[PDB]
Subunit: 306 residues, 3 copies
């Protein structure tokens, strides 16, 4: 098997994305506080069964081996990008994806995990996110058009397969917060923004092959395998922002093969070898970034009980 509960369902209106380092927290204390998160999750589900209360807990490469003495195949840390643009890496031990139809429930789950250990861990970010109008990024463009939509497709794209042993129905998480320069963006003509993205702004209709430039965002993030077959990821990104400061997109993807995300990042930032970079990177900036492993619910339970 069973994916953790946030991965497969369609996105809810509210989320919290948490990345942290253990600092003074022990592995046993971490298990206790994941169990505390689960306890409050379970309790509120019984009280609010329509509130779409969902979560995933995932782990960095180093702490994972402290929980389970075997790596999933291909698990590794994200590598920085030194291309036309720079992409940073900020390693984190624990990632928590909380989501619900309600902002107060998203907070309740975070509160439950952190109760009594606020000063024992080092939280890199606890990002509050929200659906933004009709599923748009704050550029005004719809985000998610080519994301897998059917349940079975979402599972096939995101989840490790049955012959991964205990790692089956786990998933690799790539999480990276972007901050937008909307003032620079808003000076562009709409036609130009559509050239940068590769889809139309109002409708998200894909631009024709003649009209879409090679450096458009979705030209760079569409990737094929050796046989020329398209390779996909399951995105769960959500906007965030404050009027006073950063505003942008919290990018997150679930995948059964981090090599797919490596390739897209190479092509966006300009390290793929073909001399091209994503023109959208002239208007948005990544501020963190890491890779994690989200076990299945059954494997997570084994870890908590060990």
């Amino acid at each position: 098997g069973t994916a953790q509960s946030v991965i497969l369902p369609l996105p809810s209106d509210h989320a919290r994305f948490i990345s942290l380092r253990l600092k003074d927290l022990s592995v046993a204390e971490l298990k206790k506080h994941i169990a505390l998160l689960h306890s409050t999750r379970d309790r509120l589900i019984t009280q609010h069964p329509a509130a779409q209360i969902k979560a995933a807990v995932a782990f960095g490469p180093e702490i994972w081996l402290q929980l389970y003495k075997e790596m999933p195949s291909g698990f590794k840390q994200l590598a920085p990008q030194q291309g036309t643009f720079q992409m940073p890496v900020v390693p984190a031990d624990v990632f928590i994806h909380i989501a619900s139809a309600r902002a107060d429930i998203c907070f309740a789950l975070s509160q439950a995990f952190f109760e009594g250990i606020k000063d024992k861990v080092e939280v890199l970010d606890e990002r509050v996110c929200f659906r933004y109008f009709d599923g748009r990024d704050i550029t005004g463009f719809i985000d998610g058009t080519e994301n897998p939509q059917f349940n079975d497709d979402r599972a096939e794209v995101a989840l490790l397969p049955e012959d991964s042993g205990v790692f089956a129905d786990g998933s690799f998480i790539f999480a990276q917060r972007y901050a937008h320069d909307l003032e620079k963006w808003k000076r562009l003509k709409v036609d130009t923004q559509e050239q940068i993205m590769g889809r139309t702004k109002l409708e998200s209709i894909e631009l024709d092959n003649e009209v879409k430039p090679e450096n458009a965002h979705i030209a760079r993030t569409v990737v094929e395998d050796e046989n020329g077959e398209e390779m996909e990821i399951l995105r769960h990104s959500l906007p965030y922002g404050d009027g006073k400061g950063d505003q942008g997109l919290f990018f997150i993807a679930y995948t059964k093969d981090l090599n797919i995300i490596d390739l897209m990042l190479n092509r966006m930032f300009g390290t793929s070898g073909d001399g091209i970079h994503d023109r959208l990177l002239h208007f948005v900036t990544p501020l963190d970034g890491a890779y994690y492993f989200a076990p299945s619910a059954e494997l997570l339970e084994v870890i908590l009980e060990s």
Copy 2:
């Protein structure tokens, strides 16, 4: 496998039903514009996952062989009724069933199909339909009481089985628009209208065998095989009308065996051999009628890619 998306779910509040002949449109152009419909369908699903965006595309027996080289078993055109009342047959090459919780989305899918080809095809009808109060026909009687209701029952009744090969999860459509003579109908006592339909008006309680006439509508549309077991169809009929002109029911059924609909129509129009016809035909009039085959979503995709 997969039935086309409109067949199995319970009916939505809004629909459009389209019958057309290719006229000047080429088979290649037809595949292009189905794909355009599918493209707008898919895009709007992503943006409105709760809007119940559904459709089926189906083909007449004459054009099907130009799209696929094998004929599903039992596929033939609707035959005329030389009965007490006459039933017209108006062949069409393409039938399109569009449904949604929202009227604007129904329009958007039709607009997507027709963009740039309005004068190349011969549209027989594009009927806007709506759920009418608590699922009633404009006679005031509830329509659907004995329709299969469970998902499994609906699939069993409407869909070709696994042994049909490529044709599995396809379905045959019978579509026929009716105009009602409400002036005549409303001159009846309610007790008489209940005699004519075979259920009570307010509640749709079935009349007892002692009270139900042999020429009541549901006495004629209940049919059984050689072993006395009832044969069923999956109706998706919906009211339509304008105050200024025609008002009625757009009748449509999905079935895995067109012979069942042949038998019901024979009993209705008075050619089954017992000399009885449906008294309801004194108050409603068929204005067209045809049979079609709706492939599975997989087979349709193969047709589109071919």
Copy 3:
């Protein structure tokens, strides 16, 4: 297989719980009126598919063998308690659990069953029940926290397994109305109420083992098999009351093994052998109580058609 429709879904906002003895009603008449209940249920489902229209019909052990040739293994009548507190048994021939999102639908189903037989049966109770604020008992404590929640868990706990043959997907019902003494309850400090229940009042957080007393309600109702595994039941209890008179909880549980309920009641009322009783029983009084068997929907259909 198919459990009767009310068992597995999460609870709706309104219910009616009916217990009766046949008195002058014949077995044939009983089947007729169960069929009338089913007919009205089916008809209303078609008109209100979102109104959560559900029911279970179940039978006492005394009448079951008049309806079917074989007893499900272990079926028996409730036994009385003579412990710290007394528990009479009030046997009944037929139990009906009616539920819906709407009170009028609940009445409609009861009306349909009873039409024309009100003076033929001996109705012991027809209790109108309602969800009380956020799923609470009128004590103010949330009721349901440790109930099975996932559909598959609820099925495993409540339903007879496949090796029960024709009884597979049947369920045993224990139904028992309680009246509360709220004036006595409300004189307690909340911390004492939490001692009595074993969970916190506002949040239903379980009390730590060191603070939960041995005679707390959930200390008595948490029961363990010989191999150390906790034995569960599926509760569907709902509050009832009138300002002028009795107010309380209509307790009802579905289980695959009545021996589980036996042990729970023994521990609560003080006859289990450890000399302890449930302190909650100082504030609530049982007013009836009996065991029933709810067949699968298919087995129920066999009984109706025989």
